[PDB]
Symmetry: D3
Subunit: 132 residues, 6 copies
């Protein structure tokens, strides 16, 4: 159909703030299904640098990587119709109420969730987090 | 600015146990129930009348089948600017914060119908509540 | 163990916009709607029949007035052990975790009625859904 | 980027039992209460000061009568970009996802006031919290 | 009627954990009304010692007082039918799901909320927090 | 007083979209995920080990068929008095306020498993997390 898979990361601030189920539930309620999922008490720095490799020349790169290893993360592969753009829209931004970030986050770095933004992004990120 | 509008809660809402969730979003916005009917399975003729303006579309027959595939609730709601406001609450599967935006992810199975104009509202109310 | 039970959503639920909240608690426990009627104002006779076993109590006339003071919904619900389970969901105004426990705080205006036995369930269903 | 902004929970919130719902939406976006006052009935001159920019509008007197028709809460909230973000949370009755979008449907009774600029924030905080 | 007033404290752990509205909302949803309310960025130690004066000989007294001044608190007078025992039941305990503490707390000290337990308690505690 | 305990989210939770609802109730009581695994379909011998104390009951085979009928999540949770408190959160289908009390209505399909003693906790954690 329009069936896709996408990669979501629950960032360390979500564990710190006890918002993990809240974020996952918003995705669950829109009828997206968990296909694979891993809990990382602390993700390998190399995985993070790989994950954010397109950001490696940006001023925020090192602070971002520091944050992403500052606490646990969960990586999830979600499946559903048009999953990539729909889950991206769910993620939203800190300016847009109704979305995960819009309702729950208020920082340029600590924003609770990553979601893939393209088919190409999704394939690669999935490969990073679930090589098997 | 007081109006009445017709809402259908579609069979997917029953399947996914989202009936109260949908009604509650409308309730919390202060719209009031004026009348309501529960159909274990809506008569097909009522559905064909309801979606008559769609009868030539490729999706019509599949839509009718779906609408009869489980229960529905037909509700008449009342409040200021009801038609437009309840249409906004319904929303679409792209934009979060609305019923479809938060809860639906399909072009056919999208939980809720709401009248979109004064004419269609009068007509749809007359269909479900003659 | 499948049963049907009769639920009334009382006028205070409409007053306080708790209708969907109440229905949702029952929905989430996996009980299914079998039939449902909305009454903008219930006929007094139906109320007197409904609460007939109470007709000698000091509170009867005040109860009837209250039950007609705003809308009600009569619902037939179905599920395993429905009668007892929905009675437990209803609960009482003392113990939190239930509908009345979380949402109500009055001896009269307590949001919901649910049948309490197999006999009263059959009888109450026959009253609201003859 | 830390700012503070002034919020009023209007009497309709109390009437409809939506105080916690409104405060929780702001709480969940990580804004912090820096000070807060409950008024069973706000003195009218406070409301008139608060809405003084509106003193010449047709709705002015009716707005002030509404604002004294029940309790209100004045809150100072603190957090990053607070003035703009809480304004966005407030939203309007046409915008689902926001406080007014989900919960309000009136031009007057719309649940919440939020400061809209640094100037208005400073002034409004000084009105409700002269201290 | 059975109309009473009672005193509720929202303890510092509720601010720390962003559960303030959640606690207040549970009381609001049972139809109890706010009659008076004060925010304390930090409550005077003396008020706390007064508040918990019946506990002054207990091993935990000093640690409790330390905790109660460790962050903000809100004092609220609630009004409603049978408010004292009903709000007490809402408070509940960390062992009893369905109640505020039962759903949200898991510690003998940091338990989110205090509520008066008798008419005599309520009168006194109200006097402490709202002398006016 | 810190303990760890083992929780399974059973396949009915996935079917009815209640995974987050269940995990959120445990999260909101301040228990922490120490480790977690998702199984699109749990190997049957794992389920059989997990329920080995039940191997002689009439329902044993049907329970195991249910447990493999869909995904499950195994979680190790940590926090004060975790084994007993999460068991209480689990509750039963007769006790409103608990997970099963609010959400379940079946003897078999009841959404969640939680360890019931220190012995069973240690053993169950070793089954799902041999590491
Ligand atoms: N100045 C910045 C900008 C972004 N970031 C972080 O790194 C990611 C930047 O990616 P981005 O700008 O493509 O944002 P999204 O695509 O995640 O919305 C953000 O999600 C932030 O977590 C940061 O740490 N500092
Ligand atoms: N390709 C399609 C498009 C619409 N439909 C259904 O037809 C209904 C009416 O279509 P519409 O485009 O007017 O949608 P709305 O006005 O309900 O948003 C939709 O709500 C869908 O349930 C369908 O079954 N297949
Ligand atoms: N003093 C009273 C007692 C009960 N009632 C009403 O009468 C209904 C039936 O009374 P009941 O004692 O059988 O209560 P339930 O079985 O509904 O818990 C209650 O639900 C109240 O609404 C009343 O109006 N005044
Ligand atoms: N016709 C009107 C317009 C506004 N108002 C009230 O006056 C307040 C200030 O008006 P406004 O247009 O600046 O609205 P906001 O900035 O609060 O969105 C509104 O929030 C309404 O509560 C009114 O009572 N009657
Ligand atoms: N060992 C203890 C016991 C209680 N406490 C605290 O002080 C209060 C003790 O009061 P209590 O035993 O009467 O408990 P409640 O009446 O608050 O349920 C508790 O609410 C805890 O906040 C403590 O800090 N350490
Ligand atoms: N007749 C039964 C009883 C229990 N069971 C399942 O077996 C599990 C273990 O039974 P139990 O009586 O120890 O229940 P709990 O300790 O999980 O409450 C239950 O959680 C049910 O999922 C079943 O499938 N059929
Ligand atoms: Mg990006
Ligand atoms: Mg249309
Ligand atoms: Mg009775
Ligand atoms: Mg303005
Ligand atoms: Mg005590
Ligand atoms: Mg057992």
């Amino acid at each position: 159909a329009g069936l896709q898979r996408t990669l979501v990361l629950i960032k360390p601030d979500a564990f710190e703030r006890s918002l993990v189920a809240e974020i996952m539930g918003r995705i669950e309620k829109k009828n997206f299904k968990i296909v694979s999922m891993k809990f990382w008490s602390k993700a390998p720095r190399n995985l993070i640098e790989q994950h954010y490799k397109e950001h490696s020349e940006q001023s925020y790169f090192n602070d971002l990587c520091d944050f992403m290893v500052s606490g646990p993360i969960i990586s999830i592969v979600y499946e559903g119709t048009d999953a990539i753009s729909k889950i991206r829209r769910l993620q939203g931004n800190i300016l847009t109420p109704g979305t995960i970030r819009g309702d729950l986050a208020n920082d340029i770095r600590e924003n609770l969730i990553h979601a893939s933004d393209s088919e190409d992004s999704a394939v690669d990120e999935i490969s990073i987090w679930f090589p098997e």
